[PDB]
Protein backbone atom coordinates (compact mmCIF):
# COMPACT_ATOMS: atom_id res chain seq x y z
CA UNK A 1 0.00 0.00 0.00
CA UNK A 2 1.17 3.55 -0.80
CA UNK A 3 -0.07 7.03 -1.80
CA UNK A 4 1.52 9.83 -3.84
CA UNK A 5 0.96 13.46 -2.87
CA UNK A 6 0.75 14.13 -6.62
CA UNK A 7 -2.34 11.92 -6.74
CA UNK A 8 -4.05 13.17 -3.56
CA UNK A 9 -4.36 16.55 -5.27
CA UNK A 10 -5.98 14.96 -8.32
CA UNK A 11 -9.02 13.92 -6.31
CA UNK A 12 -9.29 17.21 -4.43
CA UNK A 13 -8.98 19.22 -7.63
CA UNK A 14 -12.48 18.00 -8.46
CA UNK A 15 -13.85 16.68 -5.16
CA UNK A 16 -13.01 20.15 -3.87
CA UNK A 17 -16.48 20.94 -5.23
CA UNK A 18 -17.84 18.99 -2.27
CA UNK A 19 -14.81 18.11 -0.13
CA UNK A 20 -12.45 21.15 -0.11
CA UNK A 21 -10.23 20.16 2.82
CA UNK A 22 -9.92 17.84 5.85
CA UNK A 23 -12.82 19.85 7.28
CA UNK A 24 -15.51 18.37 5.08
CA UNK A 25 -17.98 15.50 5.31
CA UNK A 26 -19.74 13.75 2.41
CA UNK A 27 -22.98 11.81 2.98
CA UNK A 28 -22.95 8.20 1.82
CA UNK A 29 -25.50 9.31 -0.77
CA UNK A 30 -22.98 11.65 -2.41
CA UNK A 31 -20.20 9.06 -2.32
CA UNK A 32 -22.46 6.33 -3.69
CA UNK A 33 -23.50 8.54 -6.60
CA UNK A 34 -20.16 10.26 -7.16
CA UNK A 35 -18.32 6.96 -7.19
CA UNK A 36 -21.10 5.09 -9.00
CA UNK A 37 -20.70 7.77 -11.67
CA UNK A 38 -17.26 6.27 -12.29
CA UNK A 39 -18.47 2.77 -13.26
CA UNK A 40 -18.50 0.45 -10.26
CA UNK A 41 -22.09 -0.43 -9.22
CA UNK A 42 -23.45 0.77 -5.87
CA UNK A 43 -23.22 -2.90 -4.86
CA UNK A 44 -19.42 -2.65 -4.87
CA UNK A 45 -19.49 0.95 -3.66
CA UNK A 46 -20.81 -0.48 -0.37
CA UNK A 47 -17.53 -2.27 0.35
CA UNK A 48 -15.53 0.85 -0.54
CA UNK A 49 -17.55 2.94 1.89
CA UNK A 50 -17.30 0.49 4.79
CA UNK A 51 -13.53 0.20 4.30
CA UNK A 52 -13.13 3.97 3.80
CA UNK A 53 -15.62 4.76 6.60
CA UNK A 54 -13.58 3.46 9.57
CA UNK A 55 -16.01 5.41 11.78
CA UNK A 56 -19.26 4.29 10.15
CA UNK A 57 -20.87 7.70 10.63
CA UNK A 58 -22.54 7.58 7.24
CA UNK A 59 -20.31 10.56 6.46
CA UNK A 60 -17.01 10.54 4.58
CA UNK A 61 -14.41 13.04 5.69
CA UNK A 62 -11.70 14.31 3.37
CA UNK A 63 -9.60 11.44 4.75
CA UNK A 64 -12.28 8.84 4.16
CA UNK A 65 -12.41 10.45 0.72
CA UNK A 66 -8.67 10.21 0.08
CA UNK A 67 -8.54 6.54 1.00
CA UNK A 68 -11.84 5.88 -0.77
CA UNK A 69 -10.74 7.35 -4.10
CA UNK A 70 -7.30 5.74 -3.86
CA UNK A 71 -8.74 2.41 -2.78
CA UNK A 72 -11.41 2.64 -5.49
CA UNK A 73 -8.74 3.28 -8.10
CA UNK A 74 -7.03 0.06 -7.00
CA UNK A 75 -10.25 -1.95 -6.99
CA UNK A 76 -10.45 -0.81 -10.62
CA UNK A 77 -6.77 -1.28 -11.48
CA UNK A 78 -5.20 -3.37 -8.74
CA UNK A 79 -5.59 -6.65 -6.88
CA UNK A 80 -8.47 -8.27 -5.03
CA UNK A 81 -8.98 -6.83 -1.54
CA UNK A 82 -10.01 -8.67 1.67
CA UNK A 83 -13.13 -8.03 3.77
CA UNK A 84 -12.82 -7.39 7.53
CA UNK A 85 -16.29 -5.83 7.77
CA UNK A 86 -18.64 -8.64 8.94
CA UNK A 87 -22.11 -8.80 7.38
CA UNK A 88 -23.90 -8.47 10.74
CA UNK A 89 -21.17 -9.09 13.33
CA UNK A 90 -19.06 -5.93 13.59
CA UNK A 91 -16.44 -5.95 16.40
CA UNK A 92 -18.46 -3.63 18.66
CA1 LIG B 1 -17.08 8.50 8.36
Swiss-Prot record:
Ca(2+) binds at residues 53, 55, 57, 64. Signal peptide: none annotated. It is found in: Membrane, Clathrin-coated pit. Expressed in all tissues examined. The highest level expression was found in the kidney and testis. The modification Phosphotyrosine is found at residue 10. The modification Phosphoserine is found at residue 29. EGF stimulates phosphorylation on Tyr-residues. Residues 7-92 form the EH domain. Residues 40-75 form the EF-hand domain. May coordinate the cellular actions of activated EGF receptors and Ral-GTPases. Homodimer (Potential). Interacts with RALBP1, CRK and GRB2. Binding to RALBP1 does not affect its Ral-binding activity. Forms a complex with the SH3 domains of CRK and GRB2 which may link it to an EGF-responsive tyrosine kinase. Interacts with RAB11FIP2. Interacts with AMPH, ITSN1 (via SH3 domains) and SGIP1; may be involved in clathrin-mediated endocytosis. This is RalBP1-associated Eps domain-containing protein 1. It comes from Mus musculus (Mouse). The chain holds residues 279 to 370 of 795 of the full protein.
Amino acid sequence: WKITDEQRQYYVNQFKTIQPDLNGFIPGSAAKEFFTKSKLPILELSHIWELSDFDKDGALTLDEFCAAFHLVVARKNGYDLPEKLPESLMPK
